[PDB]
Amino acid sequence: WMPAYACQRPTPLTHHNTGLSEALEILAEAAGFEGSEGRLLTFCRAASVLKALPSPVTTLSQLQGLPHFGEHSSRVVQELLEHGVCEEVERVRRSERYQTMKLFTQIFGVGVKTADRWYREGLRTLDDLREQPQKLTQQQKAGLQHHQDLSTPVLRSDVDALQQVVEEAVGQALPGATVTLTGGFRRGKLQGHDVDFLITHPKEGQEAGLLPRVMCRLQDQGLILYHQHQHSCCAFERSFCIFRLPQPGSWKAVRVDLVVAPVSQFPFALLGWTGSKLFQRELRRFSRKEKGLWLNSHGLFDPEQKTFFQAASEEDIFRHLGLEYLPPEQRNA
Ligand SMILES: Nc1ccn([C@H]2C[C@H](O)[C@@H](COP(=O)(O)OP(=O)(O)OP(=O)(O)O)O2)c(=O)n1
Ligand SMILES: [Mn+2]
Ligand SMILES: [Mn+2]
């Protein structure tokens, strides 16, 4: 038996059902491209169940008793087991709609709504986008300029080099300020699409004005290709960057998100930013539906009492929600 919420079970980085989960995730992604959010979530949940299993699914009889495995997902696994291929998945892969939506949405600064609009307006290729620069934001222009590098998986070796320069800039700007690697790399991933860093200082308020100083230092070192700074609006101060990472004999553009949180909110920010995306969605749904609390990256709010939970760590937050603690490497839902 396996619990229904992804936040109630460990999901390790590596598992026994990668073929099956990949197929389901292609269908989830395609659903998202069509605005079918219910179907996306359904396929994502089924895939995440497969990732939690201790053994490969070799026969359809092994699906018995598993949550989030309705008819459609079961059929997909069945076809794969029996024929080595699922016709629906193959049709999606070969479809111009899917291929174009994948192409566009992968670009830095492009979401589903933008990609769909462009598709509807007859754009198909990266060259098509470059021929219509008036349709692009400055962020999207930068994404197109560096698209080859940005499509190349970011490696742990890149992360370690980037963490060094970010730590050096932070330390020189403000002694005592800290840099914490978050995102997929905190969960143990060997690769990723970017590097996510969370910045704070143990004295609340000492982090004010830190990020612009950090960016000035990095820019002066030639390490920044693109930088968009945004102050907290609603809602953390952040900088969406493309770094120029030096390599032996060359260099590589790499997406980096730098996020500043006040130390009082750090545990919530670390939890939120560590993911996985599905793990956090499930954690938020659990908090709301089972405990009547609203969890986000800033806090944990009781809407009846109008109170916020004071957490010193991620462990505190899990405990407060009545969940066994899962370290980041078991959040790979
Ligand atoms: N729609 C989103 C987007 C992001 N996040 C959170 C969870 C992610 O882990 C984190 C960082 O976002 P990324 O897109 O960088 O996700 P990962 O770092 O997990 O994956 P990758 O290896 O592709 O960078 O922010 C989220 O909850 N919901
Ligand atoms: Mn990331
Ligand atoms: Mn990111």
Coordinates of C-alpha atoms and ligand atoms in Angstrom, one line a residue, residues 182-185 187 189 191-196 257 272-277 280-281 284, ligand 1:
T182 CA 17.7 25.0 -4.1
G183 CA 15.7 23.6 -7.0
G184 CA 16.4 20.2 -8.5
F185 CA 20.1 20.2 -7.6
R187 CA 17.0 17.3 -4.5
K189 CA 19.5 15.8 -9.6
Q191 CA 21.3 17.9 -14.3
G192 CA 18.8 20.7 -14.8
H193 CA 17.5 23.6 -16.9
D194 CA 18.8 26.3 -14.6
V195 CA 20.4 26.8 -11.1
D196 CA 18.3 28.2 -8.3
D257 CA 17.6 32.4 -10.6
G272 CA 8.8 26.1 -1.9
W273 CA 11.9 26.6 -4.1
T274 CA 13.3 23.0 -3.5
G275 CA 10.2 21.4 -5.2
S276 CA 9.6 19.2 -7.1
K277 CA 6.8 21.3 -8.7
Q280 CA 4.9 21.3 -3.6
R281 CA 1.5 21.2 -5.4
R284 CA -0.2 22.7 -0.7
Ligands
LIG1 N1 5.2 26.3 -11.5 C1 6.2 26.1 -10.6 C2 7.5 26.5 -10.8 C3 8.5 26.3 -9.9 N2 8.1 25.8 -8.6 C4 9.1 25.6 -7.6 C5 9.5 24.1 -7.5 C6 10.8 24.0 -8.2 O1 11.6 22.9 -7.8 C7 11.4 25.4 -8.0 C8 12.4 25.8 -9.0 O2 11.8 25.8 -10.3 P1 12.6 25.1 -11.6 O3 11.7 25.3 -12.8 O4 14.0 25.5 -11.6 O5 12.4 23.5 -11.2 P2 13.6 22.4 -10.8 O6 14.8 23.2 -10.4 O7 12.9 21.5 -9.9 O8 13.9 21.7 -12.2 P3 15.1 21.9 -13.3 O9 16.1 20.8 -13.0 O10 14.4 21.7 -14.6 O11 15.6 23.3 -13.1 O12 10.4 26.3 -7.8 C9 6.8 25.5 -8.4 O13 6.4 25.0 -7.3 N3 5.8 25.6 -9.3

